[PDB]
Scaffold this active site. Structure first.
Site, PDB file in Angstrom:
ATOM      1  N   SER A  67      21.318   4.547 -17.043  1.00  0.00           N
ATOM      2  CA  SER A  67      22.565   5.589 -16.637  1.00  0.00           C
ATOM      3  C   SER A  67      23.047   5.007 -15.350  1.00  0.00           C
ATOM      4  O   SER A  67      22.493   4.614 -14.534  1.00  0.00           O
ATOM      5  CB  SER A  67      21.694   6.788 -16.546  1.00  0.00           C
ATOM      6  N   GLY A  68      24.309   5.232 -15.411  1.00  0.00           N
ATOM      7  CA  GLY A  68      25.418   4.867 -14.118  1.00  0.00           C
ATOM      8  C   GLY A  68      25.499   3.138 -14.160  1.00  0.00           C
ATOM      9  O   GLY A  68      26.430   2.882 -13.288  1.00  0.00           O
ATOM     10  N   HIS A 128      25.416  12.670 -14.529  1.00  0.00           N
ATOM     11  CA  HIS A 128      24.165  13.257 -14.985  1.00  0.00           C
ATOM     12  C   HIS A 128      22.981  12.842 -14.416  1.00  0.00           C
ATOM     13  O   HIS A 128      21.721  13.341 -14.700  1.00  0.00           O
ATOM     14  CB  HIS A 128      24.019  13.002 -16.588  1.00  0.00           C
ATOM     15  N   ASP A 177      31.672  12.195 -16.874  1.00  0.00           N
ATOM     16  CA  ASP A 177      30.155  11.759 -16.696  1.00  0.00           C
ATOM     17  C   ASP A 177      30.236  10.461 -15.310  1.00  0.00           C
ATOM     18  O   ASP A 177      30.177   9.427 -15.607  1.00  0.00           O
ATOM     19  CB  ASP A 177      29.304  11.368 -17.662  1.00  0.00           C
TER      20      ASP A 177
END
Ligand SMILES: *[C@@H]1O[C@H](CO)[C@@H](O)[C@H](O)[C@H]1NC(C)=O
Ligand SMILES: *[C@@H]1O[C@H](CO)[C@@H](O)[C@H](O)[C@H]1NC(C)=O
Lengths: 332, 364
Positions: free
Chosen positions: A282-283, A137, A186
């Site tokens: 994120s990530g 994402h 994801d």
């Protein structure tokens, strides 16, 4: 289905038991140390996609629960008992090592910051000197173009990351079965233009093998530049904190995330009230220690608030994506 | 270690304590509602009591039972209840089982004696009763069990006086998913704390307190029901309640906040019958050894001589003191009762009942 012989090769357990797939018995089996040297090990590491990388290879006592012992160039000699009573275990790259408030240098050498238009956007983890694991994402349209992205490694402060001094991203690969609505699968891969130089501040983290035997509430760690509040500014300094795994059936119950967790997801955090577990972005990495090696368990995907009761963090389940990653790293 | 006074006289024609008649009553309570009775100013026979009730075991702590015979006490306090068969070991001194954690805690710092006995099964009727007033305020009624089942608590919870387990109808009606049951709370009480959240694409996802239930709560610091152990002399504060079962869905202001019966958690039961008898427990507490007028008739009393012209300490018909005694003829004893008083100076004389002699009493 032009399968010369059948299947490929893997490592098993927290001791890297070298296993092969046999086309005649249709199962995985270890390899005997009998007539094995270093040149044979480089043929196995290149097969999984590590290319010129190679670390070590020795023989140990088998603990993969296997009975029967012993692709292209398949030296297929099946048996039932190894001579010298030793199975071979090899490592293809030196990973899972670190040092021994704010994070110290060398404490999380696999963490990176990813910038777009000279501002931090997402985080990621290093597996090889050219490959980086992040979240899908982070790279939706229009950020699918690899030219937007640059990476910074071995640096703990945002004000120390200057425009034009970051490694350029060569290509980005999302997962072919991603869905933005439900956030299923994801995960994404990024490839650098020139490889990094490993040292006391930049090192990779090991991918997970099958048969990890993780506890129901295994102790883990997260790191990142995330804010303490859900709408706050990015942290200037890198932080880290401990979290515990949460069983999927509990995380999927009516009083948590009712029927929203899929086999490709994993939960970690705390169900109680006021515990700040928003250090990552994120990530970013989710790792755990076992057998004195650090393993990459997940990449941070989604959640619901910071330090709120009933609402833990949700991550991409790396164990179920190991094959897809080995295939992308092999198709150079 | 307080000695008996040198001269001592008991009060004649006191009634019997009738301790066996209370212990042998056929309406036997459970440990959840243990019963207490205080005895004083009466006579009792320990050897006859231990026999009139069918005693299996009798032992004392911080005391020897031989020291009881012939002694007087200020008062004797008794607690009793029936024993669930599977929980008998909970009554060992210092045990941390269910009975002493959530029903009746045995005091170990005072002088006490423990008495295990039994009654015929066909005459006994167990009386189960919930002593928690906040459990009854919000819908707990009665038990519906067999005539020999014995209720006991496993966990106890306490709340302020402003407690109410239902959600606010104004809040619940605005929930888009996971709506809690709602009703009106009594005047003076506060509503159940709830919250409306968002996750992914969902909005107005409502989350309240004490989930899943107060025994297994994920977030106990924000649940109003608090775990608590019973102290000496207390009863269980109440069963925990599943707040997700209090009120009704889409409930408005014509419904008062009540919880269904399956919402009260953390208790069980077991029979007391074995070999056609129901087993019972009792606890004695001995207050004021060698004083008062709660005396034993197990031994013959010694007729000690009234020492005259000496400074002596006395315990006369329940009243203690120190003074010198001098016998006088009946003409100078200006009363008919066994004690002679000053307008405020209290004892100035007394009449012995065992010998009809009369004495004056001066200070040392
Ligand atoms: C009443 O309950 C509130 C929270 O429900 C608590 O903060 C308060 O301390 C309680 N009352 C007293 C007198 O402690
Ligand atoms: C009390 O017990 C004694 C035995 O020590 C017995 O002789 C006596 O009759 C009993 N008296 C009463 C009133 O029970």
């Amino acid at each position: 289905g032009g399968e010369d012989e059948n299947r490929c090769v893997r490592l098993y357990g927290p001791n890297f038991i070298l296993q092969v797939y046999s086309s005649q018995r249709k199962s995985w089996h270890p390899v005997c140390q009998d007539d094995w040297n270093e040149n044979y090990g480089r043929a196995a590491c290149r097969d999984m996609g590590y290319k010129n990388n190679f670390y070590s290879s020795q023989g140990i006592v088998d603990d993969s629960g296997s009975t029967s012992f012993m692709d292209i160039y398949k030296k297929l000699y099946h048996s039932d008992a190894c001579s010298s009573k030793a199975v071979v275990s090899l490592r293809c790259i030196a990973c899972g090592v670190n040092l021994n408030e704010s994070a110290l240098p060398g404490a999380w050498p696999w963490q990176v910051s990813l910038h777009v238009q000279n501002v931090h956007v997402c985080g990621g983890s290093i597996i090889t000197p050219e490959w980086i694991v992040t979240a899908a994402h982070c790279v939706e349209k229009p950020l699918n173009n690899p030219w937007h992205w640059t990476a910074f490694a071995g640096i703990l402060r945002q004000s120390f990351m200057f425009y034009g001094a970051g490694y350029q991203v060569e290509k980005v690969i999302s997962h072919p079965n991603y869905d933005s609505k439900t956030k299923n699968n994801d995960i994404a891969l990024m490839k650098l233009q020139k490889p990094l130089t490993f040292n006391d501040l930049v090192k990779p983290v090991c991918l997970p093998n099958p048969g990890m035997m993780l506890q129901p509430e295994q102790l883990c760690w997260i790191s990142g530049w995330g804010a303490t509040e859900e709408k706050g500014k990015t942290s200037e300094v890198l932080n880290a904190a401990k979290v515990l795994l949460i069983e999927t059936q509990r995380c999927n119950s009516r009083y948590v995330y009712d029927n929203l967790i899929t086999p490709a997801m994993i939960c970690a955090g705390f169900l109680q009230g006021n515990v700040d577990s928003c250090q990552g972005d994120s990530g970013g990495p989710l790792v755990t220690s076992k057998n004195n090696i650090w393993w990459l368990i997940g990449d941070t995907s989604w959640g619901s608030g910071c330090a709120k009761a009933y609402r833990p963090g949700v991550y991409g389940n790396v164990m179920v994506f190991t094959d897809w990653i080995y295939r992308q790293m092999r198709a150079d | 270690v307080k000695p008996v006074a040198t001269v001592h006289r008991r009060i004649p024609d006191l009634p019997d304590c009738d301790i066996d008649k209370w212990l042998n009553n056929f309406n036997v309570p459970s440990p959840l509602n243990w019963e207490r009775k205080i005895f004083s100013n009466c006579n009792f026979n320990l050897s006859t009591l231990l026999r009139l009730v069918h005693t299996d075991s009798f032992s004392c702590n911080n005391f020897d039972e031989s020291k009881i015979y012939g002694s007087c006490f200020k008062s004797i306090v008794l607690d009793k209840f029936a024993i669930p068969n599977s929980r008998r070991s909970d009554l060992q001194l210092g045990s941390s089982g269910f009975l002493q954690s959530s029903n009746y805690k045995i005091d170990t710092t005072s002088s006490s004696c423990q008495l295990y006995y039994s009654l015929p099964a066909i005459n006994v009727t167990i009386n189960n009763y919930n002593p928690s007033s906040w459990n009854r305020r919000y819908g707990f009624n009665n038990f519906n069990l067999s005539s020999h089942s014995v209720v006991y608590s496993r966990y106890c919870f306490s709340v302020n006086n402003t407690f109410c387990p239902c959600a606010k109808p104004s809040f619940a009606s605005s929930c888009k998913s996971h709506k809690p049951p709602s009703a009106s709370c009594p005047i003076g009480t506060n509503y159940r704390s709830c919250e409306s959240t968002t996750v992914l694409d969902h909005t107005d996802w409502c989350r309240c307190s004490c989930l899943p239930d107060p025994i297994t709560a994920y977030d106990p610091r924000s649940c109003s029901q608090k775990k608590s152990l019973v102290g000496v002399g207390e009863h269980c504060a109440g069963f925990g309640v599943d707040e997700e079962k209090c009120g009704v869905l889409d409930g408005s202001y014509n419904v008062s906040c009540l919880c269904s019966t399956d919402a009260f958690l953390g208790w069980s039961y077991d029979t007391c019958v074995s070999n056609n008898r129901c087993n019972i427990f009792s606890n004695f507490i001995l207050n004021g050894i060698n004083s008062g007028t709660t005396c034993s008739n197990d031994l013959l009393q010694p007729n000690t001589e009234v020492f005259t012209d000496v400074c002596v300490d006395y315990d006369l018909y329940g009243i203690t003191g120190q003074g010198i005694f001098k016998e006088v003829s009946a003409v100078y004893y200006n009363s008919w009762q066994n004690l002679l008083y000053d307008s405020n100076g209290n004892i100035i004389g007394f009449k012995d009942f065992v010998t009809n002699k009369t004495y004056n009493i001066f200070p040392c």
